[PDB]
Write a protein that binds this ligand. Structure first.
Ligand SMILES: CC(=O)N[C@H]1[C@H](O[C@H]2[C@H](O[C@H](C)C(=O)O)[C@@H](NC(C)=O)[C@@H]3OC[C@H]2O3)O[C@H](CO)[C@@H](O[C@@H]2O[C@H](CO)[C@@H](O[C@@H]3O[C@H](CO)[C@@H](O)[C@H](O)[C@H]3NC(C)=O)[C@H](O[C@H](C)C(=O)O)[C@H]2NC(C)=O)[C@@H]1O
Length: 77
């Protein structure tokens, strides 16, 4: 399973909004993974698991077309 991260936010509404928008441009599960980092809560907007490298590439393209951020491969935490 391959995962992308599209943004990471201190504001939870910003993370939830990005999650909602991403659900309109991919069929992969979109979720928020929140962690403590640098004494703050960081809400990381991720999607996956994606079943193939080619689908990752096309999903990255769709996210860029939608102007939603810079979709980056991540290892799930
Ligand atoms: C793809 C991704 O997740 N990018 C985020 C980025 O990630 C790093 C990361 O490096 C490692 C993990 C590390 O830092 O240890 C790595 N990516 C991954 C996935 O691992 C890669 O190398 C560098 C970079 O990419 O982290 C930064 C924080 O350091 C995230 O930055 C956030 O960017 C968003 C989008 O620009 C900010 O939101 C915007 O804020 C402006 C005002 O500043 C508003 O006017 C905009 O409306 C708002 N956009 C949206 C869509 O809401 C975001 O700041 C806001 C204020 C927030 O935190 O709520 C900013 N977050 C932080 C914590 O700085 C980047 O998303």
């Amino acid at each position: 399973g391959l995962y992308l991260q599209v943004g990471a936010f201190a504001n939870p509404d910003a993370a939830e909004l990005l999650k909602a928008k991403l659900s309109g441009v991919t069929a992969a599960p979109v979720f928020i993974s929140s962690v403590v980092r640098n004494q703050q809560i960081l809400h990381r907007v991720r999607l996956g698991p994606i079943g193939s490298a080619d689908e990752v590439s096309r999903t990255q393209d769709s996210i860029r077309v939608a102007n939603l951020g810079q979709p980056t491969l991540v290892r799930p935490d």
